[PDB]
């Protein structure tokens, strides 16, 4: 509706509190163009003094010392003005914002409970409306004032140089807008590209028992690594486009600098209506205005989100980040692409010190007596600007492409390795409710893409800042080291102006409806006190950050004037040293603000490594065991005790002492829960026994290879989970290993009572399963599952309550297929339904799991069994 409707207050105190802060923000915004005007005056004074100095060695009533103490005093006064004004802005704005937001929360809470008979998102929505109103609207006003006044005095002092700079501004505007649009477009494209690999991951992890039972760990990994390339390539494309566009923006900026300096030089030398100080003032003022306009996009983003969340509440009224040293170790194969990226960082790190050097050269060449040599030097510096712009284009593009490629390769490798590790875990690891299909998929998709922040981009920005600081120090200490040390004294504070920014930013009936009107109002004193203390400390930090640059400039320029009056050094050297050191300090301060991504990436890397470095009790990838000759399935149960660590409901899981010879059926019929499916897990070694032994053969379960054991058992789950690849991929999947011919599949299909149906389809055998086909009937996917179970020719069958189809017509087909699937082989079938013949085996398991009944269809009459219990 409007961000002016947020402040519903006619209260005088809040309005005046906001008004004073807004006035001080306006004054602070005024300060920077004014200090730039003073800077232009100094530049004019320096140039005039240098000209007279050169003339005197081939007027004089200037006394550069007096002018420089006057300018330094003006700078100190502006510094204290900035300190006071910024303190007022932050303190008053955040205090008033906290007051109004707590009043709104109080009104909301008093209004919700009195009426006829997403909450913490609300807390975060009020959080964001207070965020839109506390400091975003003060900084926005200050930056708007800064840019408007910068453009205004740029026009006022000279209306042509600012005119051409404005005329060249749009191309940069179009480039920035296109970059902003691409930020979201490529995010959407990357999500669409990764959708397929994510779908594969969810399909595999969702049904992990089936994947592990058939030993299809390698096949799913193969599918995942095959599908990951389509998202890796889109990551590469986004990276290269972004790098090229940022290089284009940088090259355009440097071309603008060259054009402005050539045009200003022509105006100053030929026409003469511009003095060089006016040129410097105009250029710096327009640059400051552009920077302030660019920096306001965040603030406008906040304003938007906040109006939005009050549009949300307007009608409710009226484990350890320790390991990082191994991230490089894990990223060893991508050593060249990072190295090349480092070359991109080490080259584009020098652009700021070189820009300071070239600006100082332009300033110092304005005192050259020769007009033609002046023009030649200016032309040379403009050509250097053009060359540096082109170099920045190429280097930014190359750095972006290389680091995006390294990050995407690392993400793909991490995703594949994490998927392999997840597939290698035991079944119990998937029931913790902290490693869930959704959470595991999130870890595969998001965390791996996040580790690249600590891996590649972090190294790049570190190298960029290190090279920036090194080159700036080399420039500063090679011309005047004394002034270099003087400004280096303020260097740590200038860096901390941005380094500590994040560290401080991130830090009805029976009820009488009248008791709670008083227990809530007094509760909000402490949040108000902490808010006002935080606002005061924020104000002090922000005011110090804003005024430290002015103080440093004042002191350094006073000392530079002293040096010029005493030591025979150019003013251009003073400008060079001071500007280079200040810019390097700003860059370094921007560098240490890396925590919001670096800490998250380190947490992500730690979680992965913890997942990868886990040794499970039952390792499918382990080759430990002893059973090899003539498998027959002489399964035996001895006093097996199970606690079921997922849920301690039936920790007394004992009484199972059955043992069947090879070729014997064994039906487990008992209660509806905790007596049906546990032995399935024990036979599959999904969980190892705790206080019992499962004696599969001459050797026990705990000491037989899991791969070999699962290879000999055919599993038919309760619900038939089938992959969406193909019928062949869903029938030959049972023997996922080699030695699978197109034969032995026709026999399995015939034995599964499916060959006629699979023959009826036009796509006879290459039919695709899923939403792209017609197989939704249970009595057909169940038959494909049974076929997949039988093609491996397993000695043991593990029916797990199949034939759960409502239509009896399909039930008869699946049950006759299962009956033809046994053919005198060991099996443990769970059948709540009475379809299975009771002559298969004896009813022995009760609710507790105790095994007592053993007689062949004659002890079930004296003792309550399956049918005898139901008939009473």
Ligand X SMILES: CC(C)CCC[C@@H](C)[C@H]1CC[C@H]2[C@@H]3CC=C4C[C@@H](O)CC[C@]4(C)[C@H]3CC[C@]12C
Ligand Y SMILES: COc1ccc(Cl)cc1C(=O)NCCc1ccc(S(=O)(=O)NC(=O)NC2CCCCC2)cc1
User: Using CB under 6 A as the criterion, which residues of the chain lie in contact with ligand X when the complex forms?
Assistant: 4, 7, 15, 18-19, 22, 26-27, 30-31, 34-35, 37-38, 78, 81, 84-85, 141, 145, 164, 167-168, 171, 252, 255-256, 258-259, 262-263, 266, 328-329, 331-332, 335, 338-339, 342, 346, 379, 382-383, 386, 459, 463, 473, 477, 481-482, 485-486, 488-489
Residue 285 annotated as binding site: no
Nearer to ligand Y, 580 or 817 (CB): 580
Burial (CB count <10 Å: 0-12, 13-18, 19+), residue 774: exposed
Quick one: what does residue 621 bind among ligand Y, ligand X, none, with the CB cut-off 5 to 8 Å set by partner type? Answer: none
CB of 99 to ligand Y, least distance (A): 32
Exactly one of 356, 388, 471, 577 binds ligand Y (CB under 6 A); which one?
356
Contact 166, 50 (CB under 8 A): no
Question: Is residue 100 within the footprint of ligand Y (CB under 6 A)?
Answer: no
Nearer to ligand Y, 350 or 604 (CB): 350
Tally the residues of the chain: 872
**Whole-angstrom distance, CA of residue 847 vs CA of residue 864:** 12
CB of 546 to ligand Y, least distance (A): 9
Provide the b/e sequence for 228-242 (b: ≥16 CB within 10 Å): beebbebbbbbbbbb
288 Cβ contact partners less than 8 Å away, ≥ 6 residues apart: 32, 33, 36, 146, 147, 150
- Rg of the chain over CA atoms, in angstroms? 38
Question: Is residue 381 within the footprint of ligand Y (CB under 6 A)?
Answer: no
Nearer to ligand X, 76 or 328 (CB): 328
Number of H helices, E strands in the chain: 29, 6
**Whole-angstrom distance, CA of residue 522 vs CA of residue 307:** 29
**Whole-angstrom distance, CA of residue 846 vs CA of residue 868:** 13
**Whole-angstrom distance, CA of residue 95 vs CA of residue 524:** 14
Nearer to ligand Y, 356 or 846 (CB): 356
What one-character-per-residue DSSP string does 330-359 give? HTGGGHHHHHHHHHHHHHHTSHHHHHHHHH
Sheet holding 665-667, edge to edge: 665-667, 826-829, 796-799, 713-716
Quick one: what does residue 75 bind among ligand X, ligand Y, none, with the CB cut-off 5 to 8 Å set by partner type? Answer: ligand Y
Nearer to ligand X, 494 or 656 (CB): 494
Nearer to ligand Y, 274 or 642 (CB): 274
Residue 21 annotated as binding site: no
Question: Is residue 32 within the footprint of ligand Y (CB under 6 A)?
Answer: yes
Query: Closest Cα partner for 731 from 715, 749, 710?
Result: 749
What is the three-class DSSP state of 97?
Answer: helix
Question: Is residue 254 within the footprint of ligand Y (CB under 6 A)?
Answer: no
Nearer to ligand X, 481 or 868 (CB): 481
CB of 587 to ligand Y, least distance (A): 12
Residue 673 annotated as binding site: yes
- Which range binds ligand Y by CB under 6 A, 34-42, 389-397, 408-416, 677-685? 34-42
What one-character-per-residue DSSP string does 49-68 give? HHHHHHHHT------HHHHH
Would you state the structure tokens that stand for residue 780, as one six-digit string? 């057909």
What is the three-class DSSP state of 840?
Answer: coil
**Whole-angstrom distance, CA of residue 465 vs CA of residue 470:** 8
Quick one: what does residue 61 bind among ligand Y, ligand X, none, with the CB cut-off 5 to 8 Å set by partner type? Answer: none
What is the three-class DSSP state of 798?
Answer: strand
Quick one: what does residue 287 bind among ligand X, ligand Y, none, with the CB cut-off 5 to 8 Å set by partner type? Answer: ligand Y
CB of 259 to ligand X, least distance (A): 4
Contact 86, 24 (CB under 8 A): yes
Residue 670 annotated as binding site: yes
CB of 391 to ligand Y, least distance (A): 19
Please, which of residues 526-565 interact with ligand Y by CB under 6 A? 549-550, 553
Residue with the shortest CB distance to ligand X? 34
Quick one: what does residue 549 bind among ligand X, ligand Y, none, with the CB cut-off 5 to 8 Å set by partner type? Answer: ligand Y
Quick one: what does residue 575 bind among ligand Y, ligand X, none, with the CB cut-off 5 to 8 Å set by partner type? Answer: ligand Y
Would you state the structure tokens that stand for residue 243, as one six-digit string? 């790098």
**Whole-angstrom distance, CA of residue 619 vs CA of residue 714:** 20
**Whole-angstrom distance, CA of residue 46 vs CA of residue 717:** 88
Number of residues binding to ligand Y, judged by CB under 6 A: 19
CB of 35 to ligand Y, least distance (A): 5
**Whole-angstrom distance, CA of residue 772 vs CA of residue 766:** 12
CB of 500 to ligand Y, least distance (A): 19
Quick one: what does residue 682 bind among ligand X, ligand Y, none, with the CB cut-off 5 to 8 Å set by partner type? Answer: none
x/- map, 74-93, ligand Y, by CB under 6 A? -x------------------
CB of 284 to ligand Y, least distance (A): 5
What is the three-class DSSP state of 324?
Answer: coil
Nearer to ligand Y, 295 or 707 (CB): 295
Quick one: what does residue 335 bind among ligand X, ligand Y, none, with the CB cut-off 5 to 8 Å set by partner type? Answer: ligand X
**Whole-angstrom distance, CA of residue 784 vs CA of residue 399:** 52
Backbone angles phi, psi at 869, to 5 degrees: -75, -35
H, E, C per residue of 655-721: CCCCECCCCCEEECCCCCCCCCCHHHHHHHCCCCCCCCEECCCCCCHHHCCHHHHHHHEEEECCCCC
Quick one: what does residue 37 bind among ligand X, ligand Y, none, with the CB cut-off 5 to 8 Å set by partner type? Answer: ligand X
Quick one: what does residue 482 bind among ligand Y, ligand X, none, with the CB cut-off 5 to 8 Å set by partner type? Answer: ligand X
Residue 676 annotated as binding site: yes
Question: Is residue 37 within the footprint of ligand Y (CB under 6 A)?
Answer: no
CB of 32 to ligand Y, least distance (A): 5
Q: Within a 10 A sphere around the Cβ of 199, how many other Cβ atoms?
A: 13
Residue 674 annotated as binding site: yes
Torsion of CA 518, 521, 525, 530, to 10 degrees: 140
Would you state the structure tokens that stand for residue 725, as one six-digit string? 């690849």
Nearer to ligand X, 158 or 216 (CB): 158
Nearer to ligand Y, 389 or 779 (CB): 389
Nearer to ligand X, 547 or 799 (CB): 547
Quick one: what does residue 417 bind among ligand X, ligand Y, none, with the CB cut-off 5 to 8 Å set by partner type? Answer: none
Quick one: what does residue 528 bind among ligand Y, ligand X, none, with the CB cut-off 5 to 8 Å set by partner type? Answer: none
Phi-psi region of 370 (alpha: psi -120 to 50; beta: other; left: phi over 0): beta
CA 237 to centroid of chain Cα atoms: 18
Residue that the structure tokens 């600098």 belong to: 257
Exactly one of 245, 254, 337, 359 binds ligand Y (CB under 6 A); which one?
359
CB of 354 to ligand Y, least distance (A): 11
x/- map, 561-600, ligand Y, by CB under 6 A? --------------x---x--xx-----------------
Nearer to ligand X, 380 or 527 (CB): 380
**Whole-angstrom distance, CA of residue 351 vs CA of residue 518:** 62
Question: Is residue 39 within the footprint of ligand Y (CB under 6 A)?
Answer: yes
Quick one: what does residue 359 bind among ligand Y, ligand X, none, with the CB cut-off 5 to 8 Å set by partner type? Answer: ligand Y
Question: Is residue 284 within the footprint of ligand Y (CB under 6 A)?
Answer: yes
Residue that the structure tokens 């100053």 belong to: 268
Question: Is residue 287 within the footprint of ligand Y (CB under 6 A)?
Answer: yes
CB of 385 to ligand Y, least distance (A): 13
Query: Closest Cα partner for 46 from 658, 569, 618?
Result: 569
Q: Report the binding-site residues.
A: 670-677
Which residues make up the interface to ligand Y (CB under 6 A)? 32, 35-36, 39, 75, 284, 287-288, 356, 359-360, 363, 549-550, 553, 575, 579, 582-583
Q: Report the binding-site residues for ATP.
A: 670-677
């Amino acid at each position: 509706v409007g961000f002016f409707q947020l402040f519903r207050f006619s209260s005088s105190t809040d309005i005046w509190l906001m008004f004073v802060g807004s006035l001080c923000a306006f004054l602070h915004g005024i300060a920077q163009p004014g200090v730039l005007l003073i800077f232009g005056t100094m530049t004019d004074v320096f140039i005039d003094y240098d000209v007279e100095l050169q003339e005197l060695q081939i007027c004089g009533l200037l006394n550069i010392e007096s002018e420089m103490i006057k300018f330094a005093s003006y700078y100190a006064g502006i510094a204290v003005a900035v300190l006071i004004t910024g303190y007022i802005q932050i303190c008053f704005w955040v205090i008033a914002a906290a007051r109004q937001i707590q009043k709104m929360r109080k009104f909301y809470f008093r209004r919700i409970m009195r009426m006829e008979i997403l909450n913490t998102r609300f807390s975060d929505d009020i959080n964001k409306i207070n965020d839109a109103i506390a400091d975003q609207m003060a900084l926005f006003i200050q930056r708007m004032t800064s840019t408007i006044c910068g453009f205004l005095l740029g026009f006022f002092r000279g209306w042509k140089l600012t005119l051409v700079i404005i005329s060249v501004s749009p191309l940069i505007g179009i480039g920035a807008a296109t970059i902003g649009l691409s930020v979201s477009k490529f995010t959407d494209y990357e999500l669409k590209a990764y959708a397929k690999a994510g779908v594969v991951a969810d399909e595999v992890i969702s049904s992990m028992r089936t994947v592990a039972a058939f030993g299809g760990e390698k096949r799913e990994v193969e599918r995942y690594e095959k599908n990951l390339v389509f998202a890796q390539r889109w990551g590469i494309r986004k990276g290269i486009v972004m790098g090229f566009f940022t290089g284009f923006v940088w090259c355009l900026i440097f071309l603008c600098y060259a054009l402005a300096f050539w045009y200003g030089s022509t105006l100053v030398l030929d026409e003469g209506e511009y003095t060089p100080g006016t040129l410097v003032q105009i250029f710096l003022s327009v640059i400051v205005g552009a920077l302030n306009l660019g920096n306001a996009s965040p603030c406008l983003e906040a304003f938007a989100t906040g109006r939005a969340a009050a549009t949300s509440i307007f009608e409710t009224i009226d484990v350890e980040p320790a390991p990082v040293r191994r991230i490089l170790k894990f990223s060893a194969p991508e050593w060249p692409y990072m190295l090349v990226g480092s070359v991109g960082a080490a080259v584009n790190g020098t652009v700021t010190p070189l820009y300071a050097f070239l600006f100082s050269q332009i300033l110092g060449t304005f005192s050259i007596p020769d007009k033609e040599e002046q023009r030649s030097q200016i032309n040379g510096v403009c050509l250097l600007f053009v060359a540096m712009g082109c170099v920045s284009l190429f280097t930014q593009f190359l750095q972006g492409y290389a680091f995006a490629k390294s990050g995407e390769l690392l993400t793909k490798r991490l995703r594949k390795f994490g998927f392999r590790a997840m597939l290698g875990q035991d079944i119990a690891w998937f029931d913790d409710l902290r490693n869930s299909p959704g959470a595991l998929t999130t870890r595969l998709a998001t965390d791996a893409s996040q580790v690249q922040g600590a891996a590649g981009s972090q190294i790049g920005m570190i190298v960029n800042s290190f090279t920036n600081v090194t080159v700036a120090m080399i420039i500063a200490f090679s011309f005047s080291w004394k002034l270099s040390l003087v400004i280096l004294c303020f260097f740590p504070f200038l860096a901390l102006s941005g380094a500590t920014q994040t560290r401080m930013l991130t830090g009805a009936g029976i009820g009488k409806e009248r008791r709670f009107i008083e227990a809530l109002e007094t509760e909000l004193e402490k949040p108000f006190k902490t808010a006002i203390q935080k606002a005061n400390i924020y104000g002090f930090c922000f005011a110090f950050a804003q005024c430290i640059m002015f103080i440093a400039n004042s002191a350094s320029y006073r000392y530079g004037g002293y040096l010029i009056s005493n030591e025979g050094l150019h003013f251009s050297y003073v400008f060079r040293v001071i500007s280079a050191v200040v810019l390097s300090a700003t860059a370094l301060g921007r560098a240490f603000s890396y925590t919001p991504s670096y800490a998250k990436a380190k947490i992500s890397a730690a979680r992965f490594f913890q997942l990868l470095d886990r040794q499970p009790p039952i390792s499918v990838y382990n080759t430990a065991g002893e059973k090899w000759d003539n498998f027959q399935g002489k399964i035996d149960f001895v006093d097996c005790k199970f606690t079921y660590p997922s849920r301690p409901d039936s920790q007394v899981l004992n009484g199972l002492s059955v043992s069947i010879s090879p070729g014997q059926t064994l039906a487990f019929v008992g209660s509806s829960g905790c007596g049906k499916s546990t032995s399935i897990q024990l036979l599959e070694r999904f969980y190892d026994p705790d206080q019992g032994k499962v004696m599969i053969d001459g050797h026990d379960s705990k000491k037989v290879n899991v791969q070999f054991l699962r290879s000999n058992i055919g599993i038919v789950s309760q619900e038939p989970v089938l992959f969406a690849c193909s019928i062949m991929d869903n029938i030959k999947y049972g023997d996922n290993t080699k030695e699978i011919p197109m034969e032995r599949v026709i026999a399995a299909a015939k034995q599964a009572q499916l060959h006629d149906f699979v023959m009826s389809l036009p796509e006879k055998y290459e039919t695709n399963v899923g939403s792209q086909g017609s197989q939704l009937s249970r009595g057909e996917k169940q038959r494909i599952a049974i076929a997949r179970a039988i093609v491996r020719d397993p000695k043991i069958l593990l029916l797990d309550e199949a034939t759960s189809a409502l239509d009896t017509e399909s039930e008869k087909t699946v049950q006759v297929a299962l009956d033809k699937a046994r053919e005198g082989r060991t099996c443990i079938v769970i059948a709540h339904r009475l379809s299975t013949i009771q002559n298969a085996d004896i009813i022995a398991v009760m609710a507790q799991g105790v095994v007592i009944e053993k007689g062949t269809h004659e002890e079930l009459m004296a003792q309550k069994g399956a049918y005898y219990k139901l008939v009473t």
